[model samples]
Target: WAESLIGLHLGKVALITGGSAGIGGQIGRLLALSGARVMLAARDRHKLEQMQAMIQSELAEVGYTDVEDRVHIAPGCDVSSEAQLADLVERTLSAFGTVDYLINNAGIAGVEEMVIDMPVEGWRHTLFANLISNYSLMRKLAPLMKKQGSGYILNVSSYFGGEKDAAIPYPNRADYAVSKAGQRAMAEVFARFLGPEIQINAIAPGPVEGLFARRARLILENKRLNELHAALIAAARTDERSMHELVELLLPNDVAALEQNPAAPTALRELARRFRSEGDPAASSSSALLNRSIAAKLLARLHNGGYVLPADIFANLPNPPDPFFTRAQIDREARKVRDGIMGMLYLQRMPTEFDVAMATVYYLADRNVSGETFHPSGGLRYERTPTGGELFGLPSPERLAELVGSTVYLIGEHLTEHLNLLARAYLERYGARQVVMIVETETGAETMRRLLHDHVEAGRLMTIVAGDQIEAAIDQAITRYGRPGPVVCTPFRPLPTVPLVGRKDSDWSTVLSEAEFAELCEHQLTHHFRVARKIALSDGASLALVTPETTATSTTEQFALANFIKTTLHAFTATIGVESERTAQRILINQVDLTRRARAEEPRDPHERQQELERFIEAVLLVTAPLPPEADTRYAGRIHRGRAITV
Candidate 1:
């Protein structure tokens, strides 16, 4: 449920520090508008004064004339200086008796230079500015809030600080990235230590309102363009307009003036030339940031000589072109932008400071919200289908037997070690359940029968060599076993990315003929489809649709056909996951996202291949493992959805 801000924070006091400029300023204004007494502090007294005045005037506009009583500006406070922080803290404590909300929103975007180029003194400067200052502020206020009863603190973090889907790295701004990572990291640590009274959370928004601070200076002058930018933000906050509509409505005229500048590219080249000669020799239009004022000048060059009305200009931001350092490179980028390098953002625009400010205040206002990081990143993450990556927590290996208790079935792709690993892992899983090993060759079938002769006669193991009769074999097994529990379909092909040892580049001759490869591809891709009915009819069906990992490149490689077939089945299986959920069936379709990470022995030998074959065996078992009987005991309310687990 989305909580509404029904009541204004009538009696609250919010202290938002960290150079009260973009995000912090907005946060202060919003809090003050909600009737919360705001104490805004930062390094620049003039900047804070204007912000305070804005909040005061806005408050006055809405009939709240207690402007001086509501907000205070601490101008000389630099977070890096403890003495200055002491003054800010004392003033806040004096003005407002109690501080209910602490917004740690201020931080510097340290200079864009490599680690080796900077002096150790420079690194120290940023460390204090970004990370240590926030730490000191938290240490100062958390105790004060705790004594008063319950309180909340919100850290304005960056997406660069996190690694939810994959590890996020900062290229030129690694120092800033790390400091922000530490800032978010500090929240997690203090939440546990100071909680039960004061709760803490972090909000990691994408690059603020367009580009970094450096870009802001070059693009729009603070006076004219900012007023329009401010108007766009004001519309976004007060109205129900989406990101796209707001830009189209408020910023088109403002931004069009920039794009129509005839000397934009020529002017930037000279600016870079002048700056590069007199200042940092290491800088130029190296990035969107370095070339000129990153955001403003970059857009100005996007359509150098023309009038461009772009509703999605913000969304279409291009990365620094690889060879964007020369004088001609400036014109080159202008054409690239004119030609349209798509932003590909699902929301179709960049998130603004207003987005961050509202989200941060929500975290503060909602008492139940704590110990979480909010991402107002304008939809950077890709959405996976519900069927594909749905498994939450996995079951223990011991829980494997209870899952596949009725019976087991397998459809082996080849005589490879992958098939052998699956066969043996299932055998060791449960003593009560029978193992039905389906093979492609009589040689493999007979081999499996001989090894497990004792279990075969005891009616606990069976072997069937497959051909056109594969579905018949499964049907026959289903009749005898009374619906199998765990049905597995191995990869349609071996990993083709690496070549085999002592083999020629093209093993095409060995893989039957071209006619046979096509037939095999068509049949095997449908093999997963063939087993669907058997799984759907089963009581505790959890199918593991296994595929060897590699993308298709050529029609020549024998393994390439399998990968083509591999990708096909995995996608088709995603439907089963959805169907299983919709129909409330005990059906699950999981792909053992298996990867054979090859070693220095590039063209790996049979022994090398076999050694790494079962690397993902444990993950496979857990991903598709069954639910515990009476699931209330150990695996209570645990989800057993069929989900892909790749290693």
Candidate 2:
């Protein structure tokens, strides 16, 4: 059976874009193993050559010869450039004479930024690389295939754009999603246009196992864990216990009796006995007087205990007892009980690389499968194991340290903060899923922990990592966990010391001129915009902008810089929201906020006062929570992993 399938692919020439790694790499290797002549194209020439060599070596190991002559690598071709793409196609055609399979796989993840704040150049470049490049390639290669009268064009698309009901939360990525969606749309358009002669097909894949996917998963998991912890702490402060406690204490039979005989004086113990006997079908009824007595006792017990009963039970009474609970409270209690019971049910698992690749191959081989867009998912019905992390050998404490590396600590002020809390709350109110205290004082961590004792008691936390090597710690964090979720960025370290500066004369001449300061502002704006673009791509991630506590608290000179950055951050947040909607249909913007008090507590001692200021900064940092998933528009949000967060 496998040989039959292999026969379909033997001797055919297949060209792949972004063929140097991941899914594209896997597909190339598979086709090469099946005896197809493969051509790999990517911007990384060295990597492409390496993959070419590997393919040849692997094929030789399996007794396939002339492998070196069979495989070709096209490197240094940026697919977005028309000239590069043209040259790439020309080279492929010159080497192989004809391309039977054109696999469009090249793309960039693109810079992430809010739509409003995104640099126009960055937006254009991202779109050109992601969307326009594919269109260029298709137009260039399709005609050659059209002449051949029998060729296959399999465009690699993504589920984020291909599926309306996308399985994953695709936010903070306007360029990538739009490009992929365009590819899918073009696939259909081309399929119909070139039908019965040349086949144009698209493959929409769910999260694949690769570096990009791993990092995406890390980012999402970080957010999920953060929110889960927050929710647990929040729920603990409320009546989070299940309604089953109360439900188990009551029975339908006793309820039936109370409903039918409202004037009865029923003892609590007698009601319990009646409930136990209700399990039997042949239970006999008591006399009306006895029933009335039993009902009275039940009401007396409910009244004494301050228990709230459903209103339906009081419908027949001329004057019911004072209501102890509201209708909404009963509904919430019953819903919680139902949810707790249903949580035990199980479903299915995610898909694999082999599964998706094989499906693509099957389409290529089967002529009848043309003219259709295929959604190759892992599966819809799925269930997760309780200890999925353990089963997958997730990092332990030591391993996590080894994986994440050392930690870093910093501080700053002048910030504005907001996120899609509407989205986050929607997730909490809807989907069930399952934080570092950065402090300044040596005792700050301990003090903050004590302050949040209730959260700790509720088992919501991660241990504090303290050390002096800030850079290494952060490197390890980025290495292990990918980019951080949300961070409180501190301002510049104020420096005022010099050898003879303590009693030095005024230095107004050395101060930056107005022109120089304006130039500096321009430079800072450019730097901040560049940095913000990178963060935007990461999704639901934030960075702190430095500012003073309040405009009034700072001197006129100090206030200017603080006010400038504050305004900049505000505009940046707005742009991120717009771009977030365009690409992933969700908001992924940095948040900013300022503490009310502008200054820290002044201690008697100078050194101690400085420490106190640092501690005050730490408190402000701790107040910054993860961004909610809400976007500007409700339509921007979509559900993923059974919960929806605004995109």
Candidate 3:
């Protein structure tokens, strides 16, 4: 049964690009359907119109559009150009006024060719559409998002994007491959820097219908189908044997037919008749196959001998003719299926292999796996397994583990060192044990070290270094204890870079030189300052920050940053000016954009995302100052008091 939440609200808005089609469209729809006001951005007016129409239709059909408008404002945008993009943002602000979710889905892919073979113009054009536009959009929006103190930016990535060290093994398609890699890498960098406040996650689905489907179909029709069909035939051997056993159940003696009387009451009799009509076909199919046990045996033998698939396997081909990588995409589709099966196994209702074999048998019959059992007669129910069975070649948990460990895990080795520690910290602090942590080495390890201070001792934490030695560290940890902690897994990743987007320049060199960042790390590395760690809240010290209404509500840039740092890091914060800074040495301040998708949409009614420094500065004042040791002891006395004396 579906659980219903009342009086529940999203408490934020979501702005999306390329929201009119494919994955972007799906994300927009999902956000809107889940109580979020969504701003849909796309280049095509027609597609955006169609998407709005579909959303309106679903809302009306689902009984929400009547009560309130969940979805609003569709804006057309050309992401490749700055002028047009800025204009699009202007138009969206005029209509919806603010944006919260920034989904950078506007990207393009064309003609798969090697870098050497690719035309210079073509390469530039493709990169502009795929990677450069994303850079532009982010530069315009990231600062605003950061100032808001809370937001989400999701980039659409591809399977190829995750593999840098030849993980997925797509030997060709250099430009598309590089573009995807850049997209994902940029996402990682952005998430690392403007994170927690702006949660950036990417969803990459392999080959859905669109231009790629057409290209993929072309490849499939020419080369891969024959090899794929042969593989299917080989797999069909198992089904063939199962079908033979079903043939025996169809024998005349094995089947029992019930006759309905026409004299019964009109409504009751009609209901019975309808039930019988549905039940008969099901019985017939089962009985017919069971009685002819030879059919099952022959099917098994054929499966064993490789005469499995029908002649149509070579004849009736999918339209648009899927390309060479179509089958490869299909493999990912299979992996998704495997993931679904694993989910079911996790829920404990279904076991491995059993669900898979049943799904296969159900599909072979009528290509439908939607019906429920009619056990004690005249009962109606909807099965939870209905939608899940649609996946192709769903793998059991064991198989899925093997797939992820061999393929996805090794690719993500950059995260192996500190993932567990980060997760453990979160678990200890927030009671959010299920949250997953991914660390891309270098910077990630440093973050972990800071998180672990005051928790795990320095000597113990140092045992696990940031290198390939991580596996050995983990193995030793597991050996020393029984069921150590969270599962620290990884996905394919490339070498980590110290990405620093500065105020004047958009590259890493601008903010802090690489040498400077390294130096800082080296200086603090001894104290475990630059490594990753995890913590959960125990009997921990907590403080509350309160400020004057004027200062608290000010839209000043520094004021906003102070508030942001105060809330996100949960540290006592004060809006300070030059007068206050003379006494405070620890100053971590930076300029931020105020009109980003995330920040521009915050719940500040009077301030339209205060972009001016003067307006933000007026709110500056000291809100909290570190106390002396004597005062600290007094504060601790108020909370902890003296431990009970045994005397």
Candidate 4:
């Protein structure tokens, strides 16, 4: 319910930090004028008192202050200190009889200098002020709230704390960024860890300009003046107003995929199939048959295509493809591969035999590929790629299954970038539940990034997991945006951007295996639940069971039934099946690979096509195995609109 504090009068109290001016002051006045008692805390008591008086005056002007006894309390204290924060809370509680909400709004700029010139002290202060103050407030107020069983904390912030533009390519402001980042991280941590009762949230307002011509001089004198001015101008101009008018801020709900773009699906499949067939060979006696030349050319073709080309695929054939292979040349090839393969992967199931054949037989067969050569002078590696180019190490199945039970997300880069969206979209389509998440994007990337995060968050199945790894990220996300009770989100995507997939190129297998685990867990936890209903015609009565169980004579039959269910995604109509592992284990439905049909143009195969094929098959097998009943147990709950069951 939206509470309107504009004109009504009551006795609710709010303690707001940085409440002397700007956004903080505005919030304080707005809350005070609405009838709530306000405690404005800041270093400047004069300014704080002035704000209080101004708000009272505004209410007087409106003739609303006469009836309401506005509690305008001003306290001058360093919010960074635990003692001061504790005192501030104690005083607010004593004065108003209780503090229902705490708004941590105090913020300050850090030392402004180039990366090399930034002072360590500036960084520390920024952390102490922007980040630590909130922690102090939460620390002091949380226990009080637990006693009362209700409270609200709003962490006011700027948009820069998100993942976008994370690297400091622009000069200076490391402290500013770090502080904001810490503030956001802390907000998330608290949101996850602090509440089942107390609600904690953050509002990251877009850059807002102030009458900062004077403040600019103090902060920008040693830095790039023009850049600072431009930034100020942008801060003033950028907002939902501008994005709606110009950039068309497409909310997750607003985005609609273009109907005719078969190109992407076709492209992904072709490239994947090609890579699977030609580049992924195990050590073979047919090494020469798995000639370096063939692998190189196949990659060349795939590169021309647009997929986020697999590094292992690239590693198999050549350091660089043959003569005509300018990096640009390879890029063109990759683009072609991307367009065709993405289309295949999207619209179709997998790649075609003919497609794999082309990459293997035509382009790569005769090329001579050699192992990476290192520079004696410690100059650069000949391969031009970083080390660690090998199969990604798979997370232990037991560990992954355990993670699935707890968190149910795939952790890593590849799936995040490509497949997770579809998985997430499917979850939302199937599960309509309200969820929310914060997403940061690079300046230009915000549009796409926003939609992706929003869609996932709204459904409770997926969200932009933001803190750190799979566990911390999930924990924080749930803390910040989740309601009380278990909120299981899908794992992180396969490939993430900030952290490159691997330090070197060789860890493709580990990447793939882990990614598969995450994807499978997400798919199951998010989209894999089913319900059965039985109805009576005469009375028009119906009974439903969301929890379906199976029993078999032999453990083997149970395993087989589970495998069939996992792989085919089909349900057995019968209540009972012969209880034997061997009887139930036969393939119920054939898996299809439709990667080639999405494109107008055909995809090419890789040189070591058979090897690539095996790898994919292995991945599917790994992902397709039967999940233990316990795997499903973790996700059990009142299935969205269904009847509640207390365990």
Which model scores highest in TM-score? 1
Give the alpha-carbon lDDT of every model: 0.55, 0.46, 0.36, 0.37
Instruction: Mark the 10 consecutive residues where model 4 has the least summed lDDT.
Output: 531-540
Task: Report the Cα lDDT for residue 177, model 1.
Answer: 58
Cα error, candidate 2, residue 120 (Å): 2.7
lDDT of 3 at 144: 61
What are the runs in model 1 whose C-alpha is more than 4 Å off?
1-6, 164-166, 210-326, 331-344, 381-647
What digit string (tens of lDDT, one per residue) describes model 3 on residues 237-337? 23443322322222222212211434322322333344344333423321221212223333333332223234222122212211223344545445654
Give, for candidate 3, the lowest lDDT window spanning 10 residues: 531-540
Model 3: residues >4 Å from true position, as ranges?
Answer: 1-9, 63-76, 164-166, 209-647
Each model's TM-score, in the order given? Answer: 0.42, 0.41, 0.35, 0.34
Instruction: State how far residue 375 of model 4 sits from its true place (Å).
Output: 50
Q: Which lDDT tens digits does candidate 4 get at residues 303-365?
A: 321112354542433232132222343354456644543453322344332232122212111
lDDT of 1 by residue, 527-646 (tens): 554455334433335777665443223223334333334333443444345434433344556666443222232224666445445445665666556655456232332244434554
- What is the alpha-carbon RMSD of candidate 3 to the true structure? 25.8
* TM-score attained by model 1: 0.42
At residue 525, candidate 1 shows an lDDT of 42
Q: Assess candidate 4 and give its TM-score to the true structure.
A: 0.34
